[PDB]
C-alpha cells in the first residue's frame, strides 16, 4: 500500500483505489495502473522533473530502502492477476530488486523527489509507475 500526496491530489495504483478514491476521481488510466483522487487537506511531496535513471524505493516487505537503477518508462508486458487480463502497462520503469504485491504503492524517489510508485514485480525486477509525466500534478 501506499500514496503521493501533492496539492490537492493523492495518486495510488488504481488496482488499489477505494470507494472514496472513485467518489473524488480525477484523473484514471488502466494502462498505466494509476488513479489521482482530490484531496481536502494540502499535500506536500515534491514532484521529480527530470530524466534520473537512479534512485531509491521503500520496500514494506522488507521494511527497507533500496538503491536502483531503473529503466526509463516504456511499455511492457505485465502477466494476468486479478485485476487486470495480461496487457502492455505503459510508462513503466524496471530495476533488478526484490518486491512484493504488498509492496505497491511504496515510492520511488531521486535527488529531485518523488519519480513514481512500485506497481508490478516478479523474477527479481521490481516495475514502478512514472509520474514525473504529469505536470498537471504541481498547477
Ligand atoms: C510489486 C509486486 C507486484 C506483484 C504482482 C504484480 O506484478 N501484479 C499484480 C497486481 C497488479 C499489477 C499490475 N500493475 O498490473 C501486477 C508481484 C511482486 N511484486
Ligand atoms: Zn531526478
Given at each position: 500500500?501506499?500514496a ?15 470507494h ?11 494502462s498505466?495502473?494509476?488513479?489521482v ?7 506536500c ?12 524505493y521503500?520496500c ?7 538503491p536502483?537503477s ?18 502492455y502497462?505503459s510508462?513503466?520503469?524496471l530495476?533488478?530488486?526484490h518486491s512484493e ?7 520511488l524517489?531521486?535527488?529531485?523527489g ?5 506497481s508490478?514485480?516478479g ?14 500534478l504541481?498547477?
Amino acid at each position: 500500500s501506499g500514496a503521493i500526496y501533492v496539492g490537492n491530489y493523492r495518486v495510488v495504483n488504481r488496482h488499489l483505489a477505494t470507494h472514496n478514491d472513485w467518489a473524488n476521481l480525477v484523473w484514471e488510466d488502466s494502462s498505466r495502473d494509476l488513479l489521482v483522487s482530490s484531496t481536502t487537506a494540502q499535500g506536500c511531496d515534491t514532484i521529480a522533473r527530470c530524466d534520473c535513471q537512479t534512485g531509491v524505493y521503500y520496500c514494506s516487505s522488507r521494511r527497507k530502502h533500496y538503491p536502483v537503477s531503473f529503466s526509463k518508462p516504456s511499455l511492457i508486458f505485465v502477466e494476468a492477476s486479478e485485476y487486470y487480463p495480461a496487457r502492455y502497462q505503459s510508462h513503466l520503469m524496471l530495476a533488478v530488486g526484490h518486491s512484493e504485491p504488498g509492496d505497491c504503492g511504496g515510492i520511488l524517489r531521486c535527488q529531485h523527489g518523488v519519480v513514481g510508485i512500485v506497481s508490478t514485480g516478479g523474477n527479481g525486477l521490481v516495475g514502478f509507475a512514472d509520474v514525473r509525466d504529469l505536470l498537471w500534478l504541481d498547477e
